[PDB]
Write a protein that binds this DNA or RNA. Structure first.
Lengths: 108, 138, 98, 94, 81, 98, 83, 108, 94, 142
DNA sequence: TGCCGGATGCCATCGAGAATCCCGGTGCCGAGGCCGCTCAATTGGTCGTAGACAGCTCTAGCACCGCTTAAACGCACGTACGCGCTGTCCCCCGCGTTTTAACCGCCAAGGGGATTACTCCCTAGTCTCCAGGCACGTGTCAGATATATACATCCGATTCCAGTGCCGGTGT
DNA sequence: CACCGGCACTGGAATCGGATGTATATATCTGACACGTGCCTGGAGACTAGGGAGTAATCCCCTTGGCGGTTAAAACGCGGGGGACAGCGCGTACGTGCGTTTAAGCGGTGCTAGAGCTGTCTACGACCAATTGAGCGGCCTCGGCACCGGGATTCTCGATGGCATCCGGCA
C-alpha cells in the first residue's frame, strides 16, 4: 500500500476535505455528491476565514493588544462594506456598537 | 477567472441627517459706499430724538431683521449706505419695501434722514432710496 | 457647589457606554421575568443558565437597534428628545406592525 | 463520552499563516465556529436547490461555483471564485 | 410569580438608550419599552418551548433558544450551534 | 373662468388610482430599459414576454410600497410634500442601505 | 445594437401616477431623479440574479421562472406567474 | 382483488393524498416518510384553501359579482390579520392596493 | 410532456363552500402558487426537525410541530384540529 | 383538543399620526360680566385713535395671543370684561402680567380705557385690573 | 417737575475641580503545548446508471411598416405651503441622602439528562392493473362597452361694509 | 408746510347658484369557461424482508433552593434652565389648465434561432473490505491582562469689571 496523503495536502488547503465530504453526504442535501465539490467548498471557507481574520488582527494590533476578542471581530465586520452586507442580520455576543454620534447632538 | 492582487476595501457610508445652520452673535454691518449716519451730526441729532418705533421700522428697512432696543440706535448709526448699485435685485427689493410702508412712516423716515417731508409717496420713496445708496451730509 | 449644565453628563455617559461591552440589565430580575413569561406556555419548566444568557444578549441587542432607529426618527423631525411616536413609526417602517 | 466535532484547529492554522504572533481567545473561537457552519449551510442549501431546479441528481463544482456568485457580494465573489478554481486545478493535476 | 415587568428599572432603560446614542428621554418611554420587550420575549419563549416540547424534554437548552432566534431571522453567534 | 382648487384634482386622482389594478408604466420604455440593463452582464440575450411582465409587476409593487413609507415619514415631520430626505430615511430604516 | 439613455423613458407623469397610487398629495421637484436611481438599483440586482440563474442552465433566453425564482431569493415572493 | 378506494375518500378529504405522498418522497426531505404525514399535510392545505376561498367569495358577493378575480383575493388577504401576517411578504399580480388615505391630507 | 396542477381540487373545495360561485383562470394561477408555497414551508420546517433530533423518518408529529411553528395564534389551533380528525378517520376506517 | 365552530376573525390596526390641528379658533375670548369696549363710545373713540403697538400689547394682555393687525381693533372692541372673579388664579396671573409691563405701557393702556394716567405703578395695575373685571361706561361726556 | 443718581441687567477670564491618560508593580487563571488511542479517513477493485453528445422538429421571439390617436411636453399664473423668527412655561436633567436587594461564597438533594439492550412492528422494494386525471373541442352566458340620465359636490360671483388714501381746500 | 371733508375705491362672510364629476339603468356583443370525451400511466392492492425506535434500566450532572454578609445601585426630592410648542409673516415653487408634438399600441407579415425531445454510449460515484495515523480528551505550565495606585494633562464653567437705560425720590 502507498503512504496516505490527505486530500487537503493534495489541494494545498488547510481545511479538511474529508470532513466536508462526510458532512455533505450525511446532510441529506442530495443523493449523490461529486468528487470536486468538497475541494471547492473548503477553499471558499478557508478564503473567507482568512479574510476576516486579517482585519481582526489589524484591529487588535491597532488597540495595542495581542489576542483577539469578540470586540475586534465586531469592529472588523462593521467597518467593511462587503462583510457587513454578508452579515447584516447576525448578532455577535459581546460585540458592542460602533462609536457614532449624530452631529446635531454635539454642543456648539 | 483568476484575479491577481488583493481585493479593494471600501468604507461604509452612514446616513447623517442635516445639521442645518445657526448664528449666535453675527454682529454684521455690510459697509456701503457712504458716510456713517452717526458722523452726520444732524442725522445723529434726529436719531437721538426719535421714538423706538421709527428706529424699529428703519432697522427692519436697513437689515431686514428686528433690532433689540439697546442695539437699535447703534445699528442704525453705524449704517454707511448700501453696497449695491441702482437697478440691482436688492435695489428693487428695497424699493418695494418702501412702496409697502404707510405714508406717515415714510414721512418719519425722511425726518430721521434730514429729507424733506413734502411731495408724493413715489418721491419720498425715490428720495429715501437715493439717500440710502449714498448717505451724504446735507 | 459645583453644578454641570444639562447635557454634558448625558454625552459623557454616551461615550462611556458606547465603549464597553458588559450587560446593562441585572441578571436576577430578567431571570424572574423570563420564568414568569414561560409559565403560561408550560408548567414546572426548567432553564439552563446558557439559555437565559442567550435570551438576555438577544434582548439587549434588539433594544439597542430599536433605540438607534428611534433616535434617527426623532432627529428627522427637528427634535432631540425621543417620544413614543418615534418608536411607533420605527416599528411600522421596519415591518413589525400592520 | 461521545467525541465532539469542531473546526478549532483549522482556524488556528489559518491565523498563524496571516498573523504569526497573534493569539486567540476561547470566546473568539466560539464565534468563528458558528460562522464557518453558518456559511456552510447557506452555500450547500443554495447548491442543493439548483440540482432539483434543473432536474439533476449530482452536486459538482459547477453548482458550488454558481451558488457562491449568488450569495457573496460584488468583490468577494470575484476573489472567492478564483480561489476555488486554483484549488480544483491543483487537485486534478496531482 | 406576579408583576415581574417592574424588574426592568428606569435606569436600565436609560443605560440601554445611552448605548444607542440618545441624548434626551421623554417620561412615557418606559411603559412602551416594557411592552415591546414583553412582546419580543413572549414570541421567542413560545417558539423555544415548542422546540423543547417536540423533543419530549423538560429543560430548555440554549440550543433551542438560538435556533428560535434563527427562525425569526435573528441569528445569534457564540452560543453553540 | 372655472378653475379647480389646488389639491382637489390630487384627491380625485388618488381615489381613481387606489381602485384600478392595471399597470401604470408604458410597456415599450420599460422593455428598452430592461434590455439596456441586461446587455451589460451578457450580450445577445433574449427575453420572454412573461419575464418582462413579472419584472414590471415586481418593480411597480416595490415603488408603491416605497412611496407609501415615504408619505408616512413626510407626515411625521409636519409636512405634506415628500422630499428626497424622506426617501433616504425610509430606505435606511427598512434596511436597504447603511 | 446598443441601447443608451432609456432611464429617461420613465416619464415624470408615470412617477406621479405611481406616487398617487401610494396616497401622496404633493411631490417636490427633486423626487424624480432619486426615484429613477432607486429603480435602476433594484432592477440591476434582480436582473443580475436572473442572468446568473439562466447562465447556469446553459440557455440564451430568460424565462419567467428565473425571474420569479430570483425574486424569491431576494425575499420578495411573487404569485401568479407559475411559482 | 377488491375494488380500489382512494385514500382521500378514506380520510374524507378533497385534496390528493397519493400525489402529496409522491411529492414528499421525491422532494429530497428525508430518507423515509411515515404513513400518516400526507393525510395531515393534505388536511392542513385543504383547510387553508377553504378559508381563503370563503373570504374571497364573500368579497366578490359584496362587490356585486359572481366570479372571483385577483382583486377580491387581495382584499380578502389584506383585510384579515392572520392571513396578512402569514402572507406579509407576498405580491399578488393584478391585485392593486387597499383604499387608504391619511386623515391629515383630507381637506377641512 | 405531462403537467400537474391543483386545478380540480381547488374547484372541488370551492363548490363545497360556495355552491353557486365561479372562478377565473387568473385567480387559479394564484391559488396554485399559494398551495405550493405553503407546501415547501411546512415540508422544509418538518424536514429539519427530523435531522434536528437525529431522526430519519417524518411522521405526523413532525408535521404537527411544523404547523404550530409557522401559523399564527388562532390559525394554528384550528389547523391542528383538522389534521387530527383526518388521521383518526384514516386509521380507524381502514 | 378538537374545537367547535369557526375561528374568530380580527381586524388589522393601521397607524395614524394625530394632527391636533383646526377644530375651530380660540382667538375669540369668553364673554365677561360687563359692557363691550365698542359700546362705551369714549373707549371706542380712544381705541380708534391709538397706535397698533398699544393695541398689540392690550390684545396680548386680554387674550394671551398676538393679534393680526386687522382683527386687533375688532378683538379688543368685543371684549366685555373677564368671566373670572377677584382672587382667582386667572386674576393673580393677569396682575403679574400687569406688574411686568413698563410704566409707559400701563399709562398708554389707562389712556385706551379712559383711566387716569396719574399715580403709582401698583395703583395703575389695580385701576386697570378692576376695569378689566367690570368695564363700566365712565359717564364722562366725550 | 425735571433732571440726577446708580443700579441691576449685560459682556469678560480665570484656576478649581473634575475628568481622563500614562506608566510602574503584582498576581492569577486561561491559553498554549505534550500523550495515548481509536475511530474516521484513506486505498484498491466492481458495476450499473446519470450525464454528455449527436441530430430533428417546430414554436415563438425578433424584425419591419403604416396609422390613429392619446399621452407627453412646454408655458403662464397665482396661491398655498415650507421655513425662519420670537416668546413662554413646563418638563426633564444634575446632585445629595436614604433605602434596598443584587451579588458572591458554600451545602445539599434529587430530578432529569445521557447511554446500552431487545425486539417488534413499520416502511421500503416489486408486479399487476385499472380508473382518475389530462389534452382537445365547443357554445353560451357573465362581464365589458356604449349612451342617456339624475344626483352630489365645489368653487368662485355678490356684496357689503367698514375701512380708508388722498385729494383738495383753508386761516394759521 | 400745517388742518379738515368728500371723491375715491377697498376685501371678510354668509347665500345662492351653475359646471362638472359620478353612480345608475338598459342594450349589444363576444370570447372565456364549464362541460363532455377518449386515453394513458401512476396510485392501489398484495406481498416479503430488514432495521428505527419505543421501552426498560442504570448512572451521574447540575438545577434549585437555602443562608448569610457587603455594598453598590435604585428611589425620592429639589431646583432650574432650555427645549417643545404655538403663533406670525414672507417668498417662491408646484398645481391647474391650454395648445402643440410625438411615439405607443394595434394589426399584419416573415424569418430563423434554439428549446425540447429521443437515442447511444461510457466514465464516474456508490458500495465493500482492510489499514493506520489525526485529532480529541486529559493534563500541566507560565505570562497577558486586570487591577491598583501615583502622578500628569486637559476640559468646562461660574467668578472678576464693566456699560448704559430703570425708579422713586428730594431741594
Amino acid at each position: 500500500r502507498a503512504k496516505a496523503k490527505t486530500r487537503s495536502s493534495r489541494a494545498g488547503l488547510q481545511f479538511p476535505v474529508g470532513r466536508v465530504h462526510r458532512l455533505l453526504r450525511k446532510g441529506n442535501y442530495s443523493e449523490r455528491v461529486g468528487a470536486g465539490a468538497p475541494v471547492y467548498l473548503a477553499a471558499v471557507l478557508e478564503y473567507l476565514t482568512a479574510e476576516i481574520l486579517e482585519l481582526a488582527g489589524n484591529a487588535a494590533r491597532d488597540n495595542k493588544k495581542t489576542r483577539i476578542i469578540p470586540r475586534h471581530l465586531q469592529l472588523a465586520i462593521r467597518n467593511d462594506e462587503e462583510l457587513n452586507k454578508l452579515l447584516g442580520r447576525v448578532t455577535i455576543a459581546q460585540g458592542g456598537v460602533l462609536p457614532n454620534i449624530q452631529a446635531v447632538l454635539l454642543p456648539k | 477567472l483568476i484575479v491577481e492582487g488583493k481585493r479593494e476595501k471600501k468604507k461604509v457610508e452612514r446616513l447623517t441627517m442635516q445639521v442645518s445652520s445657526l448664528q449666535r452673535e453675527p454682529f454684521t454691518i455690510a459697509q456701503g459706499k457712504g458716510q456713517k449716519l452717526c458722523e452726520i451730526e444732524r442725522i445723529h441729532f434726529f436719531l437721538s430724538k426719535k421714538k423706538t418705533d421709527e428706529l424699529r421700522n428703519l432697522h427692519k428697512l436697513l437689515y431686514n431683521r428686528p433690532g433689540t432696543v439697546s442695539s437699535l440706535k447703534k445699528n442704525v448709526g453705524q449704517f454707511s449706505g448700501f453696497p449695491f448699485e441702482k437697478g440691482s435685485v436688492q435695489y428693487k427689493k428695497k424699493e418695494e419695501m418702501l412702496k409697502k410702508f404707510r405714508n406717515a412712516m415714510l414721512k418719519s423716515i425722511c425726518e430721521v434722514l434730514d429729507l424733506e417731508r413734502s411731495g408724493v409717496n413715489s418721491e419720498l420713496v425715490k428720495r429715501i432710496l437715493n439717500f440710502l445708496m449714498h448717505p451724504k451730509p446735507s | 457647589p459645583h453644578r454641570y449644565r444639562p447635557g454634558t453628563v448625558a454625552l459623557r455617559e454616551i461615550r462611556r457606554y458606547q465603549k464597553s461591552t458588559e450587560l446593562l440589565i441585572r441578571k436576577l430580575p430578567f431571570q424572574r421575568l423570563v420564568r414568569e413569561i414561560a409559565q403560561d406556555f408550560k408548567t414546572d419548566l426548567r432553564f439552563q443558565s446558557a439559555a437565559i444568557g442567550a435570551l438576555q444578549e438577544a434582548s439587549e441587542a434588539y433594544l439597542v437597534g430599536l433605540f438607534e432607529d428611534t433616535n434617527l426618527c426623532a432627529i428627522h423631525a427637528k427634535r432631540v428628545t425621543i417620544m413614543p411616536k418615534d418608536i411607533q413609526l420605527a416599528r411600522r417602517i421596519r415591518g413589525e406592525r400592520a | 463520552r461521545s467525541r465532539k466535532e469542531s473546526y478549532s484547529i483549522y482556524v488556528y492554522k489559518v491565523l498563524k499563516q496571516v498573523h504569526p504572533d497573534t493569539g486567540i481567545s476561547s470566546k473568539a473561537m466560539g464565534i468563528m465556529n458558528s460562522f464557518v457552519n453558518d456559511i456552510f449551510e447557506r452555500i450547500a442549501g443554495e447548491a442543493s436547490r439548483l440540482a432539483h431546479y434543473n432536474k439533476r441528481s449530482t452536486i459538482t463544482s459547477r453548482e458550488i461555483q454558481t451558488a457562491v456568485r449568488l450569495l457573496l457580494p460584488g468583490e468577494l465573489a470575484k476573489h472567492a471564485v478564483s480561489e476555488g478554481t486554483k484549488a480544483v486545478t491543483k487537485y486534478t493535476s496531482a | 410569580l406576579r408583576d415581574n415587568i417592574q424588574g426592568i428599572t428606569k435606569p436600565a432603560i436609560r443605560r440601554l438608550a445611552r448605548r444607542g446614542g440618545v441624548k434626551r428621554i421623554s417620561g412615557l418611554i418606559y411603559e412602551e419599552t416594557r411592552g415591546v420587550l414583553k412582546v419580543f420575549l413572549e414570541n421567542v419563549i413560545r417558539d423555544a418551548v415548542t422546540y423543547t416540547e417536540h423533543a419530549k424534554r423538560k429543560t430548555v437548552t440554549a440550543m433551542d433558544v438560538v435556533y428560535a432566534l434563527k427562525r425569526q431571522g435573528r441569528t445569534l453567534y457564540g452560543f453553540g450551534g
